[PDB]
Write a protein that binds this ligand. Sequence first.
Ligand code: PQQ
Ligand code: PQQ
Lengths: 253, 255
Amino acid sequence: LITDTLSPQAFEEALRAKGDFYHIHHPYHIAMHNGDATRKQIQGWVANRFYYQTTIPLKDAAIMANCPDAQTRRKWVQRILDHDGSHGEDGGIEAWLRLGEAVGLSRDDLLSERHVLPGVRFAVDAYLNFARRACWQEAACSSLTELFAPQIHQSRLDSWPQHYPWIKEEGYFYFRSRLSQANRDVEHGLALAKAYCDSAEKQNRMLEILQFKLDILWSMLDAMTMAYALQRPPYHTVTDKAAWHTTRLVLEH
Amino acid sequence: HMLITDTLSPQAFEEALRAKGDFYHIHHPYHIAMHNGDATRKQIQGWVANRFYYQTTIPLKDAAIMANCPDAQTRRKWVQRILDHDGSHGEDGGIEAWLRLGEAVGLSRDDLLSERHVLPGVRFAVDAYLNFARRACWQEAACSSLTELFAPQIHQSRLDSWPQHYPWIKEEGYFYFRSRLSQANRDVEHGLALAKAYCDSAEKQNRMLEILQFKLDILWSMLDAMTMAYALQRPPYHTVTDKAAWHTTRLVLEH
Ligand SMILES: O=C(O)c1cc(C(=O)O)c2c(n1)C(=O)C(=O)c1cc(C(=O)O)[nH]c1-2
Ligand SMILES: O=C(O)c1cc(C(=O)O)c2c(n1)C(=O)C(=O)c1cc(C(=O)O)[nH]c1-2
């Protein structure tokens, strides 16, 4: 709990220290990294994360709508170009849709968002809803869990080949595409964070912002655990069909 | 599930709403345990602490609906929801009462008011209700209240089962559950009238059913989060620290 303002460099080490709570340390992730995860578990994860992926562009749009600095928008929109892809077959979102195929799910399995668990949907929407209401700097800097993302993206490129041979070749792309896209992201991220967070007030609060971002990732996995590892999906005492809501209600009729 | 193809009458539509009661959180194992006498004190306290986050969002959510509602006649009625929870004169209202339930289960007012024990999973689910009331049209947002149709039964279940299983819970903690037997029924009188007048086509009736399902998923995910933390010894970050490390602030409302 910072009393005396930290410096552009001491604050960078408070930020990265929050990587100790990153979702790499979540049993659900730990079981995937070791090969103990089943087919249904890996599928649920890819389909649920696709809600997270198709949201990033929304959220970055929302930041841009809140940010009147032309120069900052000129950078930040590359995050959107990245995920939507310039034209028809490219994208981080296509590439995920591909990673779906490569674990034996259709495109429609994903695009339908039918397998997206409410616990996941709520965690993720809270990211969006934050980006919509907060001042753009804060929403922008909440992206900074991209710091820790390279290491976890590699973590999968290593171990899924050996411990999960059946995962088609061309899905590993996204995780690859990201080893760089996230180091560029963060380079803006950090210059912003380092710059804007120029007092003790703003430092403490941005740390709490980051915890929130971390809480979201953790809760996404928590709903995945309950459903796919523990045989405890929504309404399991009442039925074994999927009964949860499946539509982004406010965005679409 | 089911689907409507041909616009149901008002009265038939009401029953299709009531059939969603099969998916109420009274059927969550976290509630069944508490109901049966197999909950721990830690579990009851955690539940009480976490549900306070829901109680204090109710008036925010209702105030959002009112902000989105240009019909003064509907606002004259809806605002009573906020008077019920906020109280008028001081140590009255739902929120205070829920504080007294906190006390009755061995917690201090401050344990609740600090919001330090509100699990991120609960907060995200409760927050999604608020966010929906803020953005959706007022009628849809008002109608998402109608899980209240099922609430008197759940409140009665606690009143019926908790004294025998947990007699260390003080009598005065039951006030809230009791007060809602009637407030939930007044509430639902209006909500049903609204649903029945507004949902007058098939598209709207199906969309309402999905809105009610969304509400139902909120309540269920709240308890999922409580399960992970208080029944499965799996609170956020349990593999790294056994300190509470989640964020504890409504970031968009307060510093
Ligand atoms: O696979 C991962 O564990 C992981 C984590 C995160 C993160 O830490 O927020 C992102 C991504 N992937 C990712 O693919 C991505 O595009 C992304 C964007 C952001 C952001 O906040 O703008 N985080 C993340
Ligand atoms: O204890 C319960 O199971 C329960 C459930 C619900 C519900 O169904 O949303 C409410 C309450 N309690 C309650 O105490 C309350 O004041 C309340 C207001 C509302 C609403 O949506 O506007 N739901 C509920």
